[PDB]
Amino acid sequence: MGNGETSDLEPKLTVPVGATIHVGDSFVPMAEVLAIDKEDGDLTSKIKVDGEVDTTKAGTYVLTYTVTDSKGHEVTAKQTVTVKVREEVKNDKPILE
Ligand SMILES: [Ca+2]
Numbered sequence: 567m568g569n570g571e572t573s574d575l576e577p578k579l580t581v582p583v584g585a586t587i588h589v590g591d592s593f594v595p596m597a598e599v600l601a602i603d604k605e606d607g608d609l610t611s612k613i614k615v616d617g618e619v620d621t622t623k624a625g626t627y628v629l630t631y632t633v634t635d636s637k638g639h640e641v642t643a644k645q646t647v648t649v650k651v652r653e654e655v656k657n658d659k660p661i662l663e
Pocket of ligand 1: 574575576577603604605606635637639
């Protein structure tokens with residue numbers, strides 16, 4: 567038996583650096599993020615999705631995506647999501663302390 571020194575390429579992780587959606591809008595992290603390796607194959611299923619994006623409250627939520635190749639190469643990237651309101655709801659100073 568034995569092994570040959572083949573140049574393994576580190577997995578190509580594809581993640582959008584920034585996203586913008588509305589309150590009540592749909593957001594699927596596993597649809598917009600992919601990961602492909604040449605030697606091991608499709609690593610999209612291996613993607614670790616950290617963080618949480620809410621679509622009921624307006625604000626910025628950052629998601630983390632980390633994927634590892636079986637050959638030992640690991641890569642990670644983040645996505646900055648910004649949710650905004652679909653109507654005019656003004657703020658009269660939240661007096662709730
Ligand atoms: Ca590889």
